Write a protein that binds this ligand. Sequence first.
Ligand SMILES: CC(=O)N[C@H](C(=O)N1C[C@H](O)C[C@H]1C(=O)NCc1ccc(-c2cc[nH]n2)c2ccccc12)C(C)(C)C
Ligand SMILES: [Fe+2]
Lengths: 148, 104, 185, 96
Amino acid sequence: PVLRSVNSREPSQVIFCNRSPRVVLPVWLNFDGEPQPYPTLPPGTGRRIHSYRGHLWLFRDAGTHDGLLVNQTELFVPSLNVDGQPIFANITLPVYTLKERCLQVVRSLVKPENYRRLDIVRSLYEDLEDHPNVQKDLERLTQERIAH
Amino acid sequence: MDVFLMIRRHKTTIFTDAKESSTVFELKRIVEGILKRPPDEQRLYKDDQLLDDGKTLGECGFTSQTARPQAPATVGLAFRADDTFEALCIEPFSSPPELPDVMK
Amino acid sequence: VLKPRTLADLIRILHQLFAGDEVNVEEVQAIMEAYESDPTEWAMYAKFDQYRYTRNLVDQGNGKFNLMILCWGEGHGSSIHDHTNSHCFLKMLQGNLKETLFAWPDKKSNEMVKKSERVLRENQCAYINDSIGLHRVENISHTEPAVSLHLYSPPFDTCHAFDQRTGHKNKVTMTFHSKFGIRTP
Amino acid sequence: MYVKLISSDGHEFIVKREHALTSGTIKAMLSGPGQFAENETNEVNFREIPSHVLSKVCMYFTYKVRYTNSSTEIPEFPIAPEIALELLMAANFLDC
Ligand SMILES: CC(=O)N[C@H](C(=O)N1C[C@H](O)C[C@H]1C(=O)NCc1ccc(-c2cc[nH]n2)c2ccccc12)C(C)(C)C
Ligand SMILES: [Fe+2]
């Protein structure tokens, strides 16, 4: 697995900073590349947390698992603290497409067993059911990086 | 109809089963999957009688009455190192202490 | 001494030790100390909570012992508890914990006494039972988490929390944040 | 699929993994986190069970797996008097 944390054991202080209106779920990718969640961050909350050089993080909506950005991209790897300076991780909303944002709103209002009771074209039923998922994003991100 | 075997070489003992109708060569394929040696580098014995690849286990003498799960039959195994085959060598198991007198 | 090469090796050795008629606590503590903590072998059990420490069950030990990993946030600590007359081993996998030992309370309602106080360095393994006294463990680090490996034999889900004001008890049943790497709410 | 069991006198017994799980002690060892990582050798050392007892235990593994689902008749497991006490202690340690 190419997307995984390196067992550096070289500590690195990080400031997690939530600037979305969402409750943020920090997701650490362990040494086998598998996602391990961490305590959530309320909107407007910042925390000094303990991490390590070469460790991989991503950030999601804690309730819906919508993807979020950290320092304007999808993955966050802290360097080593330069002279003891913490490393900042700024968590924001991405600019979703109108379609993905509309799917988020409909998913929040309609139960999944009731998606196909909606008077919309069927291709949108499959879109509604394709719920945001960390494992699918890791697939795209992995192949995105191999294609340098 | 299954026979149950102890394939023995030096201090190694493999517990496995096979059909009475399976061949000696098929048994070497089983040994190959375990000890990573192809059948061409293997010799199988019943006591001191070397067994031919094409003969079935029943024809060699391994039957349900002589190769039971609770009392498997012993197959000797000799590997071949480079040019020639090693001598069949099996070290016996340890021996129990003498029976306590209170056990008659 | 048998130095466990991996965490799985240590667990296999522990299952053999507790299979015997007689378990030697000096031998268990020494073998648990000898395992050098490797986060790549136990990270799946390190699940943290922001406000409280977590208990993550690792192995149920064939009903003879319990193996669990506890994860301590900054400033997270235990209550003063007994061990339901069972052996309890505590090995540090990451960070440090400060163990403070207490004497059993008198029946008059006054401040429990601290018999001693120490900080367990990482890879060190401590031992405690009810005969040596009550204890409380804390992660005193303001910046670092703590991860510890606990062995309890016999396994117990109940114990007693102790107010240090009083010495008065109250029974507690202990939950699990996860079991075998799976979150259990 | 196969696991290696080593007696105190150094005899190596290669038996099927599911046969060895007949022992409750071995099952506790290898069913959970004690399972061999695949960088590890699938070896278990029993430094106090001699080979003439460990081979007998493996014969019991075969016997138990063969006849557990039988529904009309099973044979008796034979135990010679000379090994009865040593085998009883191994059976107690192995929980089977
Ligand atoms: C040597 C090594 O690799 N050890 C790993 C290790 O320490 N890891 C791997 C990663 O780098 C994060 C860091 C870790 O667990 N830090 C503690 C921590 C971080 C972040 C938060 C947080 C998230 C949102 N708010 N607060 C915490 C919240 C409560 C308690 C502890 C928290 C380990 C194997 C233990 C998982
Ligand atoms: Fe305790």
